């Protein structure tokens, strides 16, 4: 699919993902949710080739849910991101690789810190204060480089995110039909239903 953004503030991680699904000529849907909850305090958004995106995301979801049941314990965001990276690094030398890029937003309950990881389809992982995939970063990073502070509130993060989406809606040629925004903090994952 198209645009996926992420920003880590003082006490939470915010992920924004577009709603459009386009089959070449027509926009088949304008309310698509490009995310999967891997565990109560870990969310993964995704974008890439059709079919492979959801297939990969649900495959990861199933594996983390299996770990959670087996150990009766939630893996740290760092541990989940490492598992995901290895799967993609394995995939890139396969017969037919997963063409999927992801952002992993999680709140580490042990360290009481939000964490944002950016991983591309090759298995290239980086921890960041803010990240994106595709062309999304080209439009938004200059705004984030200017305004971002590590001590921002969740409300300030949402406002900086609105400025980023406005710039995307102005300068991007494609109509991505807005974004679904989700917040990850100490209390879990929730969706902002008005954005």
């Amino acid at each position: 699919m198209d645009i996926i953004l992420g920003i880590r503030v003082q006490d939470s991680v915010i992920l924004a993902s577009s709603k459009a699904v386009t089959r070449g000529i027509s926009v088949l849907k304008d309310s698509d949710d490009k995310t999967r909850q891997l565990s109560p305090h870990t969310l993964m958004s995704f974008a890439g080739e059709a079919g492979d995106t959801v297939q990969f995301a649900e495959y990861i979801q199933a594996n983390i849910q299996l770990y959670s049941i087996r150990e009766d314990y939630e893996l740290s965001p760092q541990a989940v991101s490492s598992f995901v990276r290895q799967e993609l690094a394995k995939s890139i030398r396969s017969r037919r690789p997963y063409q999927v890029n992801v952002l992993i937003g999680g709140y580490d309950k042990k360290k009481n810190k939000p964490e944002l990881y950016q991983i591309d389809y090759l298995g290239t992982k980086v921890e960041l204060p803010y990240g994106a995939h595709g062309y999304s970063g080209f439009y938004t990073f200059s705004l984030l480089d200017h305004h971002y502070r590590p001590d921002m509130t969740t409300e300030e993060g949402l406002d900086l995110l609105k400025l980023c989406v406005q710039e995307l809606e102005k300068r991007m040629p494609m109509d991505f039909k807005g974004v679904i925004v989700k917040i990850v903090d100490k209390d879990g994952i929730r969706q902002v239903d008005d954005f």
Binding site: I92, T124, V126, G137
Partner: protein, 204 residues
């Protein structure tokens, strides 16, 4: 398209009097887009240091692979692996993927704990060893590094003098490469102390 220059980056290593130095930039990118300024390319397993340039997914994969292998080595051998031995392990590991290789440019640096002798080595993506007395270079600005090192380097430099030489070699090479920069780290390595210094450089 070329896997060895998608992400960018550089590593350089040098020898001095009873010491070695290894240094790298901090950039990770997606071609023209700068993605991270905290992507360190030097790792260590005991007292043996390994720098890796090239495709970033393979950099991460190989670090994890050599941590894996050196940990098993230590458990079985009951001692830390030495630079000379580790060099052979890197070569072996790379050649086993002869016809489906990791797109990387590794660099080894360290001091042999028994002889006290300074050691450096370099590799191509498929395992060939370059064991130079003076210096080793790797990455998207390897040409630039060869030019700096060849003129700036002299043998038997004291640790604090060697720091200045390798730092100036990296900095000025990186500034002539679009895909390198965004910070830099230098390791000065003596027989039983290692100092790590982050350098101030231009952020474009």
């Amino acid at each position: 398209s070329d896997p060895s220059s998608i992400n960018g980056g550089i590593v350089v290593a040098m020898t001095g009097k009873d010491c070695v130095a290894i240094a790298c930039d901090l950039r990770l990118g997606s071609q023209s887009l700068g993605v991270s300024n905290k992507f360190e390319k030097i790792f260590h397993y005991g007292h043996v240091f390994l720098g890796i340039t090239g495709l970033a997914t393979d950099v991460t994969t190989l670090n994890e692979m050599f941590r894996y292998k050196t940990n098993l080595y230590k458990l079985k051998e009951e001692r830390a692996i030495e630079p000379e031995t580790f060099t052979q392990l890197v070569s072996s590991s790379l050649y086993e993927r002869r016809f489906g290789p990791y797109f990387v440019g590794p660099v080894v640096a360290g001091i042999n704990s028994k002889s006290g002798k300074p050691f450096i080595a370099g590799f191509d993506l498929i395992g060939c060893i370059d064991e130079a007395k003076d210096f080793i270079v790797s990455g998207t600005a390897s040409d630039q590094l060869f030019g700096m090192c060849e003129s700036l380097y002299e043998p038997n430099l004291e640790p604090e003098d060697l720091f200045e030489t390798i730092s100036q070699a990296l900095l000025n090479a990186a500034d002539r490469d679009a895909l390198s920069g965004w910070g830099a780290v230098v390791y000065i390595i003596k027989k039983d102390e290692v100092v790590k210094r982050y350098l101030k450089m231009r952020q474009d």
